[PDB]
Write an enzyme that holds these catalytic residues in place. Structure first.
Site, PDB file in Angstrom:
ATOM      1  N   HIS A  41      27.843  43.293  52.976  1.00 39.29           N
ATOM      2  CA  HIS A  41      26.906  42.764  51.714  1.00 39.29           C
ATOM      3  C   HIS A  41      27.726  41.255  51.439  1.00 39.29           C
ATOM      4  CE1 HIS A  41      30.140  44.125  48.269  1.00 39.29           C
ATOM      5  NE2 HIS A  41      30.383  42.909  47.947  1.00 39.29           N
ATOM      6  N   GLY A 143      33.266  38.301  42.399  1.00 39.49           N
ATOM      7  CA  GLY A 143      34.267  37.428  43.362  1.00 39.49           C
ATOM      8  C   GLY A 143      35.458  38.079  43.935  1.00 39.49           C
ATOM      9  N   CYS A 145      35.085  41.322  45.539  1.00 39.35           N
ATOM     10  CA  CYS A 145      34.953  42.548  46.159  1.00 39.35           C
ATOM     11  C   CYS A 145      35.554  41.765  47.456  1.00 39.35           C
ATOM     12  CB  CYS A 145      33.773  43.014  46.854  1.00 39.35           C
ATOM     13  SG  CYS A 145      32.807  43.473  45.968  1.00 39.35           S
TER      14      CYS A 145
END
Ligand code: T4J
Ligand code: T4J
Lengths: 304, 304
Positions: A41, A143, A145
């Site tokens: 992602h 921020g 992940c």
């Protein structure tokens, strides 16, 4: 003496964290050998995340579109591929700080350390468990992940988790380092409800053993039970069923303390039925379930 | 979202841990620049520890009697001195992994990370607070003394604690890195009882703010109080008195949440008087006091 929720020392993993930027999306990556692993992602706009087609989105992306920064030095991306829900970015430089490592897919009830990171920079370390519903209860802001979960066996880091998403209930979902989600979760901003967050019974029993080892004994009672009797009570209280495999795993703690596993089950049964009555065990007012039997032995024996 | 008992990433401190052996006593040392810091009781036999005269015991010790091992490489000891309850061993090699560092003496209620070590090898990291009675509630087995406590500000490690002893009640005492014990404790195997372990009120309030930020709001009530009214209740419940300095420190969390500090005090007052009624806050059944207001802001804002 004393018993703490203890994480593995994080240095070996700190040496692997990098920043990954694709367009305006920045998150964390894990640099091992000449590969950087990160959530796929990274290629999405928040808009994309409503119904992303990752293969289609990836077609618009070249090696030079993936900005990888290790400290304040840029890595050259010479290849990229999608494996399940992770991207693998091939870089031209092997991470000189790569530890001995493995990728492991853990089972529910297993514990691990998380190194929470922002922009490839470590912020903190804490201990988690894979919940029976395949969520974790983490601490992850925007921020975070690509932050990873790991166990260390002496000098070998076993990576078991990479952070991908927060469910609307503020619990966390992610993948192993092959990019396969734990549980039924998907990397999409959609309706995803967690199932029953049941208590990890074998871990509670381990922690009761830890309590006895450290002098917290008030909850030891005169009773015993059977697996089937205990399991009736476990069911009532949303505790995982206890199996003979769990009993076998608790054998060393049984041996050390001289308390039969089924006697500790009977103690746990009474605590479930009677509550704590305002008392504490190892500084907790609830029954702690994020220590494995292996954790209790490790911390009670002082392994490095 | 989510809120965890989080330690600082430990790598910078891992790079400083060494083993110190004097005769048959082995414990941990901290190697910064060309000095190794360790508890002075490294020179004692368990027998010595009943009534040690450290100056007299040290006369029998030469540089070559202090064995310092960093990984599997021996450091050459070229000097030694006693400062309060620590030895400073001068070695011929500056630690190449020395981080930016400071020595700080923390106040009660302040939190820090401990890197638990055995034979100079890191076993785990966890978060502690200096208790109001100048003990800490750690996890320390035999071989753990010389393990250190620290805070990190970006790239600067502030060392605040070195582990020295376990009181008969299984709580922990130690020194700052100038070798001065926190509280009244001495490095002697004698009767040393801790005073009242009072609750760090300002930290509880910080953690209630953290709970509100993370969506745990059930305990918010319709009441307010005054510092003096709240303090009457604090006294009754062995909570530290709340000062205007504490209120000032909570201002940013007050601002972020829009809950006046004295309103959160009134919520805390009712929780003290009514108990939890079997509910939990941020996964706890008791009021957590080992997060500082600074901790809550850091973790809620994602500082690295
Ligand atoms: C994985 C993760 O943290 N995802 C994410 C979601 C929204 C926005 C970002 C992002 O790029 N940033 C950088 C600017 S400040 C917010 C986080 C990442
Ligand atoms: C500071 C500390 O851990 N003190 C200590 C007390 C007794 C014995 C030792 C020691 O030398 N060892 C090594 C052999 S196994 C027990 C710990 C240290």
């Amino acid at each position: 003496s004393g018993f703490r929720k203890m994480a593995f020392p994080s240095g070996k993993v700190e040496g692997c964290m990098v920043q990954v930027t694709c367009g305006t999306t920045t998150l964390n990556g894990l640099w091992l050998d000449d590969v950087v692993y990160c959530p796929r992602h990274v290629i999405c706009t928040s808009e994309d995340m409503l119904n992303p087609n990752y293969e289609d989105l990836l077609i618009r992306k070249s090696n030079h579109n993936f900005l990888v920064q290790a400290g304040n030095v840029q890595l050259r991306v010479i290849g990229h591929s999608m494996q399940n829900c992770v991207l693998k970015l091939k870089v031209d430089t092997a991470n000189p700080k790569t530890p001995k490592y493995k990728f492991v897919r853990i089972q529910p009830g297993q514990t691990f350390s998380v190194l929470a990171c922002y922009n490839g920079s470590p912020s903190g370390v804490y201990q988690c468990a894979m919940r029976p519903n395949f969520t974790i209860k983490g601490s992850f802001l925007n921020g975070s992940c690509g932050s990873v979960g790991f166990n260390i066996d002496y000098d070998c880091v076993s990576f078991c988790y990479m952070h991908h998403m927060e469910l609307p209930t503020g619990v966390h979902a992610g993948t192993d380092l092959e990019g396969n989600f734990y549980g039924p979760f998907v990397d999409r901003q959609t309706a995803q409800a967690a199932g029953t967050d049941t208590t990890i019974t074998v871990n509670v029993l381990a922690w009761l053993y830890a309590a006895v080892i450290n002098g917290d004994r008030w909850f030891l009672n005169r009773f015993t039970t059977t697996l089937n009797d205990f399991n009736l009570v476990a069911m009532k209280y949303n505790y995982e069923p206890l199996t003979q495999d769990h009993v076998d795993i608790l054998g060393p703690l049984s041996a050390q303390t001289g308390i039969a596993v089924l006697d500790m089950c009977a103690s746990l049964k009474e605590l479930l039925q009677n509550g704590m009555n305002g008392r504490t065990i190892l500084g907790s007012a609830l029954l702690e379930d994020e220590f494995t039997p292996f954790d209790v032995v490790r911390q009670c024996s002082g392994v490095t």
